[PDB]
């Protein structure tokens, strides 16, 4: 019901409110954000509810509050390769990941849940997705914000994948279960995968190519054998890169 998982992060309300204030103070934003209203919309999603009975509609006021005008042709999805995807967006700073948006920035690496009959936050334990229930506050949030993120994408979407994993593309991950199935074909022309270390011939990548192609979206794939060199030339493309993109 509420156990088997880590509890809500200590000082979670202060943290969410502090993150919103800092995100807005470094992003003169589409529409002024009253961070207090944002925290209230966050709280209203899960407070005083069964933490196994959370729905996506519970989070829609927070989603509406947190809608941002993101350049849709600059979205980098990723699946289970966290550090390189975000360091890539620190350099190619015209491209965004889900954690670079307001809503992703707010909840990144946090846990939360409430209790049915009380207005309190449970800092002791929260429903674990696998062993208690799937419709818990944290999982439902990310399942919701990731769907809307994919729905906003346009013109060419890139996704970074870990080629060292035995399942380079996992159909059961958020990218496979939610994001891929929600790219709008009338807005998205191509999904280009970047496999990080020829693994574009891996059975799981061809599965991603099949799934995407039957939604009438083009598939593209690109091996990256030299990640550190690939990033070095994103910083400064002017030294030695048009001959060194080869199998190391």
């Amino acid at each position, epitope marked *: 019901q509420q156990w088997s998982g880590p509890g809500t992060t200590k000082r979670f309300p202060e943290t969410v409110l502090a993150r919103c204030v800092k995100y807005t103070e470094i992003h003169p934003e589409m529409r002024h954000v009253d961070c207090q209203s944002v925290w209230d919309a966050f709280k209203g999603a899960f407070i005083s509810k069964h933490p196994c009975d959370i729905t996506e509609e519970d989070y829609q006021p927070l989603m509406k509050l947190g809608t941002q005008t993101v350049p849709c042709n600059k979205i980098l999805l990723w699946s289970r390769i966290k550090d390189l995807a975000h360091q890539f967006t620190q350099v190619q700073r015209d491209m965004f990941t889900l954690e670079d948006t307001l809503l992703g920035y707010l909840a990144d690496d946090l846990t939360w849940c409430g209790e049915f009959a009380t207005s309190k936050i449970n800092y002791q334990s929260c429903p674990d997705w696998r062993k208690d229930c799937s419709n818990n506050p944290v999982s439902v949030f990310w399942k919701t914000v990731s769907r809307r993120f994919a729905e906003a994408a346009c*013109d060419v979407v890139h996704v970074m994948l870990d080629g060292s994993r035995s399942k380079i593309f996992d159909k059961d991950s958020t990218f496979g279960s939610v994001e891929v199935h929600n790219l709008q074909p009338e807005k998205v022309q191509t999904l*280009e995968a970047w496999v990080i270390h020829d693994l574009c011939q891996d059975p799981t990548i061809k599965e991603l*190519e099949s799934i995407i192609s039957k939604r009438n979206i083009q*598939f*593209s794939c*690109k091996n990256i054998y030299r990640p550190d060199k690939f990033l070095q030339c994103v910083k400064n493309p*002017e030294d030695s890169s*048009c001959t060194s*993109e080869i199998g190391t």
Partner: antibody
Amino acid sequence: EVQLLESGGGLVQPGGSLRLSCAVSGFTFNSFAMSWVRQAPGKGLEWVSAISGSGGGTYYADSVKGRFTISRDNSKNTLYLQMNSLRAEDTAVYFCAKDKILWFGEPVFDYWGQGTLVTVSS
Amino acid sequence: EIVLTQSPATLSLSPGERATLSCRASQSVSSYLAWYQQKPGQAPRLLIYDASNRATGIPARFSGSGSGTDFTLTISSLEPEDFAVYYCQQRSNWPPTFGQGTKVEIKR
């Protein structure tokens, strides 16, 4: 060093077909998007079509959207432009261009071929 | 599509003079603006990309400035060898578009 060498092209009747080739060397063809840019006689540059490094993703200019097909054979380092239903207004010098960006998207071109003239005439 | 307007159509300068070339986008491309040099009978040569970055091997007399809709190419110490048509090209969205070009002719 990088080299883009276009072949094919010449004289073709209105309504006929022509396939262009672009043989490349000096870079990893697989990991770069390619595009075709054309230049009518005494006119400016007009982007025709773009294709991803692996070939799956393609974009087309509206004027050729139903008649041109971009493609590539990465095992031969060759780019193709399959042109059908050619009209007089397709008469132009056709360049192949290499995307400078390290991924598929709105391109900027750092390497060009020498171009090959296509004449659509009776 | 995004329309790129270059002014003037022709510019006749003397060597050693400063060349100022304009490109005005019909809507904001914000940085995604390249500059290309095309000498007679030749393929274009990328001078500036993303509105301010010199490509490899491009002389320091070529400089790009601008953001949004107003962009400028400057050639500080013009040479007879600089007789070419210069094109601006945007990569803000699809399709990528070029301006009609400015022809720099050298006085003598």
